[PDB]
Ligand binder design. Structure first.
Ligand SMILES: Nc1ncnc2c1ncn2[C@@H]1O[C@H](COP(=O)(O)OP(=O)(O)O)[C@@H](O)[C@H]1O
Ligand SMILES: Nc1ncnc2c1ncn2[C@@H]1O[C@H](COP(=O)(O)OP(=O)(O)O)[C@@H](O)[C@H]1O
Ligand SMILES: Nc1ncnc2c1ncn2[C@@H]1O[C@H](COP(=O)(O)OP(=O)(O)O)[C@@H](O)[C@H]1O
Ligand SMILES: Nc1ncnc2c1ncn2[C@@H]1O[C@H](COP(=O)(O)OP(=O)(O)O)[C@@H](O)[C@H]1O
Ligand SMILES: Nc1ncnc2c1ncn2[C@@H]1O[C@H](COP(=O)(O)OP(=O)(O)O)[C@@H](O)[C@H]1O
Ligand code: BEF
Ligand code: BEF
Ligand code: BEF
Ligand code: BEF
Ligand code: BEF
Ligand SMILES: [Ca+2]
Ligand SMILES: [Ca+2]
Ligand SMILES: [Ca+2]
Ligand SMILES: [Ca+2]
Ligand SMILES: [Ca+2]
Lengths: 366, 366, 366, 366, 366
């Protein structure tokens, strides 16, 4: 059976092709002690690094979908195969994922490591937006994928991708976490260390939501306390946040909050549709597929529906597809793809790689 | 029973002899994907190519009544027999049509394909203007046939054709569509791709009409908005066109709008009558038969009546015959001809073709 | 003396009739601050916006030869008259230019602004391809004009234009810049903001060239590093680009690289010649005149000569005219035209405009 | 005339707008007797608390730029107006300062006290880094402000602040004093009380310096006694310190010495520049402005120049601006700002505060 | 086998590694005759000095964890090896202990004496709080060690020490004895000599306890005599003490009773936890480990539990670990450490000391 490994900027989703959910989901972090040991491993990965983060410096090897620090990324892959899935990598073909418009060397370097370090028999680097469409059972739609590092739009029509209309945005969950840390100082809460950033991410995933109308919610938050929620820190301290609950996800629709010049995810989706042929736009308007953890905010589908309806013509039916399992859509689609009989010819085997070279991995790639 | 296949530059009209209407009417297009497939046929024909045109490059195999690209034309014939009529070609004699003054190799090549690829038992290539006269139940008249690729005049008197008076004009519906695309840029509407050309053709067939007096309609369109009509594009955008509604069909009467030197269809009809013997002109003036989709513009019969009345002597009765079913007149006449008992001797059987050769197909041909 | 203002999608070329070069050449941009001012103009135009682009959002008012945002275009004209030429607009007749096949309202709106806002005594909107022919001292030739927004072919024979053979392509320099930004991500270089797009345009103008044979250059770039060039960014970072140097200009000959269906500039030029009368094609083959900044790539004249030679008959002499000053050919030709004695009757004065109306500006226009 | 009051975590700088130096500079301390009075005020402020600190418990109301203990802070403001400046607060508009990224309630509470307790006619809370740029006569630069409680970087370009690139570090002079107290125990010197902390601060300001290369200075200090300096305590005892002279300021560049995870001030400055637009980085590299008492260590400008030169590209000119009066740069800039004619509209008067409320004080604030 | 010698300010705990209790426990005193001998050693050490203290002047060589008088400390080590343990020092590696934040010369001087005077083969100076954690079988916790000279808090998490959060207080058992001597004069009891100080220490260890609520116990002691206890002096005199029983240990929680400015041991423990990372505070709250003779007061664990519960958040579980053998926790932990197999590489042998020098002894030291 094939391995499906979705290495994101934030989380590692790993499992076996054919299953309905990833078997191993853990943070893509490597932690190293930043104090003096007096009584003791050198590095910790994943959930083990998350439980001991109080004395660790946490580092993400993947930044904005791009693998920095190839030594730490190799520890995460080693932790995935031997400690989480408990399999021998040299027995299973491995399906990997990558964000579109990535550097060419990123895919070549991970292919060399999979073939020469873990000695996988075959491998394949899939398109993440294509996998999200497999998960929804569709062949047509524009995918809005937003994870921890990358937000990107990929329109697909009847199984054909339109690469010239692909949008990529280096604004995702980790930038929202950093912005939440900044605006929490307005209430006197100071989160600085990499371990405290993990606390702010937990606050974001539990209390943040997308406002249907931002300016009306700012007026409501300033006239009462009905939007105030409390949160207990790991040391028993209780913090209270008000308009920060919806100001943090609002950055997705107003990237100027963090100094970015790009347009919000609603205008980026609309601009991507308007670059497609006029004859396919009606089907794209009706199949806006959301995927990734950053699309899990309460109210983001209703907000996107409202924003795109205001940009599109009035006779168009805007339909946002947001399944409840969309946080694992890329992995679920990869599990479906790696199980298809027509896909078994797409594997890049170790033999083909020794003769063709690193250039064989850049086919059907954008 | 015999098959009647009217392969035009724009539409394929196919059916069985004896019926009153073609059973299969679909565009004569072959579409091929112009993007990358990621999730898938190689080519699409007819209405299937029209529904997926957003991701296809559409190509017409027939240009100006002449078959270019014989590989695509063979796919359209294959699509016609097996997917539209659902018959075995080797069981029915096939009646085909061709525009007059065509290259000799065009008819020879289609006869070789019908006999050696589809293995038809017998076939016959009819004269399209003769078929239009069969459809109107006449034996005398001058036929003005205008389709997607060819406009031609053929005078017939008491069943005898006058080939020296035949006029042919490579200005028809597809040139009007291209001219409409050009003058739509004056309002800021940009239609470029082959798929958008199909949209402009739909605009032409719904909103364009022939002005009775062109210069008076230009003054009316410039003094008010009573001639403005709106049209909703496939993506919900609404465009508004004014004098373009009658400027596009006006090219038929003023071919200089598209840089052509020839005279309009009214002067071409009159010049064709004036090349006929003086003793038959009175009967030709009273039997101007229109056929083809390009004669379906509202007001074109009243305009032709006015223009020819101004050219002919005042004592002549000018009568334009424009039946409501004239868009299928060639097929309807072919269905009538292929059902006649006196025609069953005109079939060119496979046996006669093996001994006589390609020269047998050029009898009663001009 | 008359003012000659060539308002392109990318650059403003302004000066006085009779001079040999434009006096004012600056980018056609309006910049507005996108941060918070704490210590301060509202908007910056041209080279002033280019020097402070780090804190500005840059916007082009002209897109694909069409003026969007008429408020920003009026600031550029105001910046041109009072800050660059330092003249009173109400004292000089102004010669303007426009791309062919433009919307009618574009020319009418700029005429209303010139007469009612700047109060020019007379004005004239010239044909850009006619001006390029004046600059080369020719009366016959097919002009290939390619700037920042529009690429168009206009054949002219003995002083007569053939409007039906005019080709227009909304693929020019700005689309090549956007494509270069996309393929620079393959090496890990991320240019996103409107200010970074100006950096990529500078990379394009310095390092990009047209390959004589594209597939052979791809093999050379993949077998060595002789095609690698370095470039120092404004912050001291040095980037290295290889095959992107000739892949970016190759889009002009293969518009499918950016998802466009149209043919390259070589086939468009050939198709334009083949729509002209057969008796003038020999003179058009010998007078292919290049103009505009996008024709300034090294090797584009040799590539066009090779591509058209392969399409034209072997007995035809293909001659590409590419003068070194062809980046200002439209302005230079306008300076020549506005100085002719026979042209002084072509000015549309303010008096003629008050009585005739906006319709007077659409004479000798296509 | 306006009052300029720079309330820092360590020192109060107060004076009149227009002067070149603060009139009143005294420690921001409140001292209360911790013994039994037998022969007698309740509390002492500033230099009076510093002279009697032997029998007092000294407390700073401001910690890390944030006002704790609002009763003690009100005594310091009262001591400033009536005992140091000897003015009536209800006659002069008061310019106050605050560190960036402070809690919103800190500024609101000090505005309420200034308007309702001291009854100032108008007031304004300025940005401290903007004032430091006014003091240096610049409109562009990245300010490194380091006082007793806060270290922060604020990049400013052409008068526009980039708030998203602002860095704040709760590591400043008071943390260096505490670290010096800790490492002085290695030589047997025990400083424990709040009065002895004032002695250690005096040792730091007289004997500590920044080493150009830290590891080479550690080797020099361990091989001889040329770096040993003596210091006479208030009771005549003489202490000798060696490598502690440069180990204490080294914490600014290696915050791990005190258990902090953040990067040093050199990497924080570089990271702040790298978050700014690429087009402004060259001007920021050349205008690194230092301000605050913690930048007064001998050799800190040469060390920062060396550290940033190693991080920046080699073609960049790194220039550290460290004027001799930079310990009062915030006050000097505030005196310049409060004297500008264009600033007299920025005052928040008592009338505007009664109607708008506390929300009026958070304009042009970050 | 290794020797474990815990040289405290008050008691010497010496024995062999592997045993469960120290073999030799005697006071760290040197006594010299202060009268005239008429009928006779020069100095007495330990229990021999304690039995003849009536005619001796008793002196502690160690003050506040720091060795003063190195001649007397060498007599105590000599008395320990040859008279108490009866071993040859040159045959056993010796594990020594030291209080944190001690002068560097203290450890260097005792290492020189152990290697050059007693000629031990190897030695090691351990961290006393680490040893107390070994004794409790824990790897996580904050140790509150309070002996005769030093009180210190050391937080340890998962075997990693946080040195920046270490608190040290020069207030311990000997200061409580001196305070008891002072408040015993209120009842007319005069203890002055160094021999009478040993009597007061015996009173403290037998009658003193920690009040759960101090102000309520003062009211109870002033309203009855239920808290009065009697004590028989060595000469048969009986003294009675009331509120002095709990006023003496109360100094640990209110150091102002003896003129010290520092906070009590409960606030010092809480302040140490609040300097640790927020993610480890919950585990530190549940593992407050007590060690040392000064933690042996009845009721001190219940008082510390009550005081820290009032400072910590209500959702935190405060657990004070006070084992009955905690007076020897440092020695017991040292016996465990010196028996570990992984520790046998940590010994500093005589050979390593001759080449590396005194600097080798300051590794893993704070
Ligand atoms: N319930 C939630 N609400 C908001 N954000 C969430 C939620 N759950 C996860 N996220 C965010 O999603 C991001 C990671 O999702 P994922 O799609 O796995 O990213 P990647 O694949 O790039 O690692 C994280 O930054 C996390 O903060
Ligand atoms: N209602 C209509 N009005 C105007 N033009 C029409 C209409 N219907 C069809 N046409 C035009 O008729 C042309 C095709 O008619 P047809 O006679 O079938 O041509 P052919 O036989 O050459 O394919 C097309 O170009 C189409 O645009
Ligand atoms: N040396 C060069 N090489 C390639 N492209 C160039 C060069 N110089 C200018 N260009 C391109 O030419 C375009 C503008 O030329 P121009 O003819 O002035 O356009 P317009 O008139 O439409 O503004 C710009 O997009 C610029 O990138
Ligand atoms: N000569 C000096 N060398 C080193 N540090 C100094 C010197 N003079 C002052 N300082 C430090 O500067 C700090 C206060 O400077 P300042 O900028 O006034 O801080 P704040 O404005 O936050 O009160 C004090 O902590 C002091 O120790
Ligand atoms: N039962 C007791 N109650 C209160 N204090 C005690 C008791 N037993 C011993 N002590 C005190 O503990 C101190 C010494 O304990 P220890 O931890 O051995 O100190 P050190 O290791 O510094 O010598 C002495 O000052 C003694 O008075
Ligand atoms: F890397 Be994640 F998909 F943003
Ligand atoms: F081919 Be159609 F009849 F113009
Ligand atoms: F507007 Be430019 F001439 F493309
Ligand atoms: F409060 Be100081 F400016 F650090
Ligand atoms: F020296 Be003891 F441990 F206070
Ligand atoms: Ca992902
Ligand atoms: Ca036809
Ligand atoms: Ca131009
Ligand atoms: Ca300050
Ligand atoms: Ca001890």
């Amino acid at each position: 059976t094939a391995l499906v490994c979705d290495n994101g900027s934030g989380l590692v989703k790993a499992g076996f092709a054919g299953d309905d959910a990833p078997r191993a989901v853990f943070p893509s972090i490597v932690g190293r002690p930043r104090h003096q040991g007096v009584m003791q491993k050198d590095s910790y990965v994943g959930d083990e690094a998350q439980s001991k983060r109080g004395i660790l410096t946490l580092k993400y090897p993947i930044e904005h979908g791009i693998i920095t620090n190839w030594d730490d990324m190799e520890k995460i892959w080693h932790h995935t195969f031997y400690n989480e899935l408990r399999v021998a990598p040299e027995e299973h073909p491995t399906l990997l994922t990558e964000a579109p418009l990535n550097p060419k060397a990123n895919r070549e370097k991970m292919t060399q490591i999979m073939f020469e370090t873990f000695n996988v028999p075959a491998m394949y680097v899939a398109i993440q937006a294509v996998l999200s469409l497999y998960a929804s059972g569709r062949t047509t739609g524009i995918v809005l994928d937003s994870g921890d590092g990358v937000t990107h739009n990929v329109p697909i029509y009847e199984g054909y991708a339109l690469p010239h209309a692909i949008m990529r945005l280096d604004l995702a969950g980790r930038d929202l976490t950093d912005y939440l840390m900044k605006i929490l100082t307005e209430r006197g809460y100071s989160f600085v260390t990499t371990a405290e950033r993990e606390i702010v991410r937990d606050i974001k995933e539990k209390l943040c939501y997308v406002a249907l109308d931002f300016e009306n919610e700012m007026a409501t938050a300033a006239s009462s306390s009905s939007l105030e929620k409390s949160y207990e820190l790991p040391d028993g301290q209780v913090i209270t946040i008000g308009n920060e609950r919806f100001r943090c996800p609002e950055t997705l629709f107003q990237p100027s909050f963090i100094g970015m010049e790009s347009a919000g995810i609603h205008e980026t989706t609309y601009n991507s549709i308007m670059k497609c042929d006029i004859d396919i736009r009606k089907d794209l308007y009706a199949n806006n597929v959301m995927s990734g953890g950053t699309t899990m905010y309460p109210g983001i589908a209703d907000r996107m529906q409202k924003e795109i309806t205001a940009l599109a013509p009035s006779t168009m039916k805007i339909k946002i597809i947001a399944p409840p399992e969309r946080k694992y859509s890329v992995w679920i689609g990869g599990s479906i793809l790696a199980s298809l009989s027509t896909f078994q010819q797409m594997w890049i085997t170790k033999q083909e790689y020794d003769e063709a070279g690193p250039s064989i991995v850049h086919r059907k790639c954008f």
